[PDB]
Design an enzyme around this catalytic site. Sequence first.
Site, short mmCIF file in Angstrom:
data_model
loop_
_atom_site.label_atom_id
_atom_site.label_comp_id
_atom_site.label_asym_id
_atom_site.label_seq_id
_atom_site.Cartn_x
_atom_site.Cartn_y
_atom_site.Cartn_z
CG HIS A 95 -1.75 -1.22 1.38
ND1 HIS A 95 -3.06 -1.27 0.94
CD2 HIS A 95 -1.46 -2.45 1.89
CE1 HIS A 95 -3.59 -2.46 1.29
NE2 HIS A 95 -2.63 -3.21 1.81
CD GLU A 105 -3.81 -0.73 4.14
OE1 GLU A 105 -3.71 -1.90 4.48
OE2 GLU A 105 -4.77 -0.26 3.45
CB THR A 197 -6.45 -3.24 5.20
OG1 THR A 197 -5.69 -3.54 4.06
CG2 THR A 197 -5.84 -3.59 6.55
C1 LIG Z 1 -11.50 -12.83 1.20
C2 LIG Z 1 -11.28 -13.14 -0.20
C3 LIG Z 1 -11.77 -14.24 -0.92
C4 LIG Z 1 -11.40 -14.27 -2.25
C5 LIG Z 1 -11.91 -15.44 -3.07
N1 LIG Z 1 -10.60 -13.29 -2.80
C6 LIG Z 1 -10.14 -12.26 -2.08
S1 LIG Z 1 -9.09 -10.84 -2.59
C7 LIG Z 1 -8.88 -9.93 -1.05
C8 LIG Z 1 -7.65 -10.51 -0.39
O1 LIG Z 1 -7.22 -11.57 -0.81
C9 LIG Z 1 -6.84 -9.79 0.65
C10 LIG Z 1 -5.69 -10.36 1.27
C11 LIG Z 1 -5.01 -9.56 2.20
C12 LIG Z 1 -5.44 -8.27 2.48
S2 LIG Z 1 -4.54 -7.21 3.62
N2 LIG Z 1 -4.53 -5.73 2.82
O2 LIG Z 1 -5.39 -7.07 4.80
O3 LIG Z 1 -3.16 -7.77 3.70
C13 LIG Z 1 -6.56 -7.74 1.88
C14 LIG Z 1 -7.24 -8.51 0.90
N3 LIG Z 1 -10.53 -12.28 -0.80
ZN LIG Z 2 -2.65 -5.13 2.41
#
Ligand SMILES: Cc1cc(C)nc(SCC(=O)c2ccc(S(N)(=O)=O)cc2)n1
Ligand SMILES: [Zn+2]
Length: 259
Positions: A95, A105, A197
């Site tokens: 990010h 973040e 996030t």
């Molecule tokens: C829940 C879920 C299910 C499916 C099928 N795809 C995604 S994309 C979002 C994602 O993978 C993700 C991973 C880590 C973060 S973070 N920014 O908290 O590290 C945010 C989004 N997310």
């Molecule tokens: Zn992230």
Amino acid sequence: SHHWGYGKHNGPEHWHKDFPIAKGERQSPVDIDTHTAKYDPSLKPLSVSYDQATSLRILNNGHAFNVEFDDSQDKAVLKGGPLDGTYRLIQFHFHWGSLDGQGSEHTVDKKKYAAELHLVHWNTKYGDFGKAVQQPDGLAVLGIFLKVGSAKPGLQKVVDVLDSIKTKGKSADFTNFDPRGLLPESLDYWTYPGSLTTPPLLECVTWIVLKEPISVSSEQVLKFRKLNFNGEGEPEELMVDNWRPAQPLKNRQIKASFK
Ligand SMILES: Cc1cc(C)nc(SCC(=O)c2ccc(S(N)(=O)=O)cc2)n1
Ligand SMILES: [Zn+2]
């Protein structure tokens, strides 16, 4: 087509309408008040075992870029620290800001860093990522702040492939990338229970945020800012300010592995 993103009409303050858990009880990121974080002598050293990591591909998903790993075998694992059991690395991403003075973040006593790296891992007791995110202990995300100063040599292969994935939905082969090159010297960390996030904002994450930032050059982060949130053949929207701001702590307690 009014999907979530990071602008005036679809950024973080809008997300609760599609994802009501946005106003939930364990949302991320948070400000880390370092004076109020409790040192916890029962926390173990973090164990980061990345020797056998197999990167596969890099993907511009329209919100950030993900470096993806083969997680079909127990190869790149995070354990110890605050964790029970074993979490497998699936992807990392960053990010960042439009300016060096913002972009992370998490914040530390309200300090914003230029960027923040998330190494995302899922709990092997749940069999895969998709099932893991439905569980309150499903993911462990290791967060590492970036500041601008000297270059991070281990980052440069990532920076050099970005011109190849400029726009939404572009991907490229990205093998033999070693994520150990992105780690700072010390694994001292703060830890607290939170969430993804980005939408779907699921409350499934044990956050482990390292105290020591890594340094990246101005030229490195400038290259991140040449990415595009739009797809090829659409008007250019630079990929900057893809961070969610700090959310209410709601009396959760952030624990420190040090002091
Ligand atoms: C829940 C879920 C299910 C499916 C099928 N795809 C995604 S994309 C979002 C994602 O993978 C993700 C991973 C880590 C973060 S973070 N920014 O908290 O590290 C945010 C989004 N997310
Ligand atoms: Zn992230």
